Amino acid sequence: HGWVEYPSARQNTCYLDGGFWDNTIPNQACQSAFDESGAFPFVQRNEVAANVPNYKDMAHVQAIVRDGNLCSAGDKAKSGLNMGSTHWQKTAITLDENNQLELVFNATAPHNPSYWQFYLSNVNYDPTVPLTWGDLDVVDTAGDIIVGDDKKYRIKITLPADRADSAVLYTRWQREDAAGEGFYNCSDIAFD
Ligand SMILES: [Cu+2]
């Protein structure tokens, strides 16, 4: 259980902006998600999750987390997260001298053994259309990472230095257990 804290996952930004209990939501993409799903996806910021027992087989992953449902990890109760918008708030990204950023994943329930896959929407992706697997390229992977003493995972990832547009970073954190729990988060970013 957890979420991408930096660059903040979509549902985490919605949550931390607040307003959804008293009709003061500040952002119009956050409002539209709320209109479709209510507060559930925001208060459940740490369980954007799907179980894939055959987790090493991407054909099995894509049968469970289906095109147009990646940001909700296939949960219809979180479907508002998947809506296309020009107004999703973006984290401005400047890569370090090695073309990296430190991704920070805040875990309420650390899980090991596990592994990580990082995907990036391609330059032809239209943010007004829900994300599909065909929109994504794998940019980096990680193995079993020990959680910090502050219950955050820190992972240096390499991103392309040729990008200057807005994109979705798609983080997959996969447990290596019988049930095959995995956590799927979309992070809206603006390369600058
Ligand atoms: Cu968990």
Numbering used by the authors: 26 to 217
Q: What does the report in the manuscript say about this coordinate set?
A:
A structural investigation of AsLPMO10B was initiated to find a rationale for its apparent role as a facilitator during host invasion. AsLPMO10B carries the canonical fibronectin-like/immunoglobulin-like β-sandwich core structure found in other LPMOs, consisting of seven β-strands arranged as two juxtaposing β-sheets. The β-sandwich supports the histidine brace catalytic motif (His26, His136) and the putative co-substrate coordinating amino acid (Glu206), which shows conformational heterogeneity and was modeled in two alternative conformations. The histidine brace is loaded with a copper ion, as confirmed by anomalous scattering, an expected consequence of the sample preparation process. Copper shows an incomplete square planar coordination, hinting at the presence of Cu (I) at the metal-binding site. The latter is likely a consequence of the well-documented photoreduction of Cu (II) during X-ray data collection. We also observe electron density “above” the copper site, where the putative ligand would bind, which may represent a citrate molecule from the buffer. In particular, the distinctive loop 2 (L2) of subcluster 2 is conserved in AsLPMO10B. Tma12 has been proven to shield its host from predators by exerting an entomotoxic activity. Moreover, we note the structural similarity of the AsLPMO10B AA10 domain with the chitin-active AA10-domain of viral fusolin, an LPMO that strongly enhances the infectivity of entomopoxviruses, indicating shared structural features that enable an LPMO to enhance the virulence of a pathogen.
The A. salmonicida LFI1238 genome harbors genes encoding two family AA10 LPMOs (AsLPMO10A, AsLPMO10B) and one chitinase GH18 (AsChi18A). LPMOs were discovered in 2010, and thus represent a recent addition to the chitin degradation machinery. These copper-dependent, redox enzymes cleave chitin chains by an oxidative reaction and synergize with chitinases in chitin degradation reactions. Can it be that the two LPMOs have different functions? In conclusion, we have shown that the LPMOs of A. salmonicida may be moonlighting enzymes that not only contribute to chitin catabolism, but also play a role in the pathogenicity of the bacterium in the invasive phase of CWV in Atlantic salmon.
